[PDB]
Design a protein around this nucleic acid. Sequence first.
RNA 1: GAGACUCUGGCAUGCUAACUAGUUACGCGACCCCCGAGCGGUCGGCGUCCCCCAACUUCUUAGAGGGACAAGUGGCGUUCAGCCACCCGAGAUUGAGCAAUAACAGGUCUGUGAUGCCCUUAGAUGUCCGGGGCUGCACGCGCGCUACACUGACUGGCUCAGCGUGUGCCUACCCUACGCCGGCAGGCGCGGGUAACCCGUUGAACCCCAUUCGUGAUGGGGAUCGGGGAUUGCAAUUAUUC
Lengths: 141, 191, 65, 141, 56, 137, 53, 19, 104, 75
Amino acid sequence: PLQSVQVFGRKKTATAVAHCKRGNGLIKVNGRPLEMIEPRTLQYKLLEPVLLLGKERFAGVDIRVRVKGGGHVAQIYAIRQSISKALVAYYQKYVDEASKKEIKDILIQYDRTLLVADPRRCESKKFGGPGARARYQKSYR
Amino acid sequence: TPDIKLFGKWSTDDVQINDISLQDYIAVKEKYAKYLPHSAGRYAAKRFRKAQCPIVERLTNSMMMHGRNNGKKLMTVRIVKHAFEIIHLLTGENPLQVLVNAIINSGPREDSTRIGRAGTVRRQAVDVSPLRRVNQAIWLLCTGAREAAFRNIKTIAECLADELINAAKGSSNSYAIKKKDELERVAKSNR
Amino acid sequence: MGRVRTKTVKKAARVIIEKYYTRLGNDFHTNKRVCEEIAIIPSKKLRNKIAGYVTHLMKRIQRGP
Amino acid sequence: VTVKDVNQQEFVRALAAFLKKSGKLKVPEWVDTVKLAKHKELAPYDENWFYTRAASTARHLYLRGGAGVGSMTKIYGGRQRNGVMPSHFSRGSKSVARRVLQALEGLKMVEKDQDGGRKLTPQGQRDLDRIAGQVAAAKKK
Amino acid sequence: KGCEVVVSGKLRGQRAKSMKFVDGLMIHSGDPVNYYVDTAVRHVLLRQGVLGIKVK
Amino acid sequence: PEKFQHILRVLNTNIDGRRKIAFAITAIKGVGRRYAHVVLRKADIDLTKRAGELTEDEVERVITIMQNPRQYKIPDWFLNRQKDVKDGKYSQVLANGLDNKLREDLERLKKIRAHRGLRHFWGLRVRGQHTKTTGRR
Amino acid sequence: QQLYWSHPRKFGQGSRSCRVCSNRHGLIRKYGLNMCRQCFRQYAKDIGFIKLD
Amino acid sequence: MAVQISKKRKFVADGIFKA
Amino acid sequence: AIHRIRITLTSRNVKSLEKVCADLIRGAKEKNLKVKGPVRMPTKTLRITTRKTPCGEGSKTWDRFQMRIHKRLIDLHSPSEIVKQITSISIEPGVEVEVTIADA
Amino acid sequence: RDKLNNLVLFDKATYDKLCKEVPNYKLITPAVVSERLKIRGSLARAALQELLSKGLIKLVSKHRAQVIYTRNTKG
RNA sequence: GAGACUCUGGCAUGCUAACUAGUUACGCGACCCCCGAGCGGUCGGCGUCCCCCAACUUCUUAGAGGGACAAGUGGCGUUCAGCCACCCGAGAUUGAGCAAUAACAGGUCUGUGAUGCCCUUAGAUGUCCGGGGCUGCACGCGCGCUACACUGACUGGCUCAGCGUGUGCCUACCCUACGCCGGCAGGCGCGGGUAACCCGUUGAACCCCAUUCGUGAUGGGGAUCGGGGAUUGCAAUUAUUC
């Protein structure tokens, strides 16, 4: 009586995946807890959906997160994203959708990148300058 | 936490942004608060979308400046978080009120345009919009502490707090005020 | 930042109506399909823009020549 | 418990102090005439640095076996200031990297293994994981 | 449907000149000009100098 | 502690008794940051302190190391004049002799009329530099 | 006589040359192409190279 | 080929042939 | 099964290349037991840049040539009688078939 | 123009002024102690370490950049 | 000609299929052996064990088709052309590539066995060899690198990418694991790779967490100059790099 479901939380070049199932209430990432990943300044930003839904709902759920690519910060904002999409999809399949509407509203009210991605990617250099828009200097004389 | 939003410690409530004009542009007292500085920050695509940005996040953005420090949000959060804490000791009061009070009484009310009469330089007083008051306030405060802390033994956190307290109240010995009164002086001259 | 249709788009929209006014209606995604079926355009995007002007045009044909 | 459940700037500190106490290393003589990398400018500020270097290494060996000298050398490589000319990257130091491993190999926490590398022994993990336990269970970590 | 011919060099004089003779419809820009044109350039030698030929 | 800070002298060279030892001794011409630290380890002197810990017993222990670093087990890839051209032995030239070595080395080249000696004499770059644009006076 | 070709070329830029134009300045050593630059651009299409960007 | 050359260098020389 | 053969295809005209695959897997699904599905390798991209002028002077502009290479591979379980049969199936355009005899 | 001479160590007069009336502040930071009393700043840091050990002041937050202490909170 | 067109980017839990791009759940089929805990279950793991009869969705794998058209709505409008704010969703879009008629005494005979006309041709402007110089310094001009410090410099510990290239070349030659010796200049041995199979999970920096320093031309800054080591080659002086 297993309840597997896997979801991705893409960012600029990051790729963060979470495998979800019933278990005994655990929020692990990559062989490490939710508290000791990467800079403790942004630790609160990971705990947003935690505090924002609480702990009653995460009771009968164990997840394992894995992530690859990008940088420090983007690798966060993906994990912030993969958690929620994994959560909401679990309910739609194993709970009534009256549940998922109850919880999707709160998320979208606080912030809208919790679910839908950000399509910005870095662009290409051109001959003449060091970057896309800038250009080298000109004497006029 | 599903009823209160702190910065970890202190709250966005219990503060009254006290004006009508400077309403509608400051996101501090709103129940749409955030636990932390910067989110992603889509707030630059349209024209008036920047009004719906939390005021501390606006402030955080402005600090990193003069080239030696670009793309250093996290550094600036350290400054801000240390900065609001040092405010708390010196007066035992929510720094948010101390912040809005400065932003309120730091936006110039009057200015002169550069209407040089087609090449014959002579200006003319005009009025100022809310959103520009808010911006020049922050810019003046940020380029306060900075030049004060450049070659000194004080750090940005203390110098930021010092100018910030002296601008909330009328201290008449802070960079923000000494310039604001100057601009009003010039406008009244060629009024 | 502007969107005007060219002669190729307009003229074909005219000819299509003047033949097949019965096949078509007021729905874009059906009007899209029939144009594909009768006519052989080289491009998916050109297919789109023609039909969008067709449908705008039918609402005018409802009343007023 | 596992070493992946603590603050790992501090686990290293406990390990070195333990490792200094038993003390069966035969540290090299040249522990005061070196710099630890071409791209440095000084020798360390801390007088006892050899012992920490072992802790970081074996800690790294736990997470990722099959890693030899040059690989460990790349790990501790860093930024190089060439003065007026721009910065670059520089690798660590072959010498201390090699000789540190040999002392641990002497100490029976690590064995030179097939297909190149050093995998930490099947009996070094006791010390490597119990010490986490005291660290994490002496007080709240 | 269309064609184009061009010729340049020393032509009735000591100064250099150029000629372009056309007929029919012709395209210049885009990217069906990679399979709807058949270009060719050549070089004729003469006692005076050289003449370039182009044809499309 | 030890509040007898004692501005002092070493080899006719004044030391400011306010800086740490690893950097106060560096005033002497011929001593740097490397040589400063390493000898202070061979002298067992703690480096937490200022120049307050410079009783005569401690300094002379450092000074004897200054003029003779070799038998105190300091390796030979570390000294200034390694395998001197005359009197070919390892040793380190220190203040007020370093100037003498610098001087005589130049006149060596001058009297012998080598390419480098002329350019030191004329007052120009010598390591193959350029002069069309830089070095203006 | 024996001193004719005495110089050990063996390396450098006065050893190689554009296979077609028999030139020495501005060559391309990538994938054995070993071709002068102007010469490459000239043909550049029978080889299969094109440009899209 | 005999010398076991990369596919990259192969296609290139195959073009140089035809030129 | 008898021999474990492997076939490789490198070319540039994708449509020609995706065609011959369909042809060969058709004959393989025609007269065989079980073969493979096409394992699509990532493309290579050769990139060159030059100055667009022969001389030095002018404005400093650049050009960027390239060519892509498309690559596929498949295997079959069968006696080698079959490969000598089906390597002849009208592979006209520029398409390099490279085939091993047993697992190499 | 701010060209001053400071003190490497105490001189028994700052100690008279530091064992008392420095804990009689609201804010405590080393840069401020250099401002009030003429010292370098290594001593601003080191004295307060002791002064916490002796137990007269209180801690708030430490960082490798800024460290913050407090009054003992007379209560 | 502009537009249309080509390439790229952004979306799909829908199709297609996979050790030579390559995993992820299960069995743990093994992890080693305690690999920790603990008196146990349970957690932990990146690579190490394979043939390849335990799925492919989510990286990059890459082909097909789909999708966005001012389409729905409120105003504005010669109520035509069309414009502004919005509902779902990516709402003109990063972006480049291609580029017309007529022209400039623009540049290139030092890119071409593309070429006219003039000059020279055995005591040569040809073609080889030895050495030197193209870098020479009272000054002026421009494209840039480093820094003028505490939002910092130094010393230790934590943690994450992507575009790429790589061995026999048209006349001469690779990227490197592992070990042993020394700081590197390194140097000896064996291995892999005609390549996402080896380097390679490309353990990159800035960042981040903690010690030292405290406004001092100061440990900021690193020009200049001395001395010693090694490496490329036939050859390092006018120091070729380290």
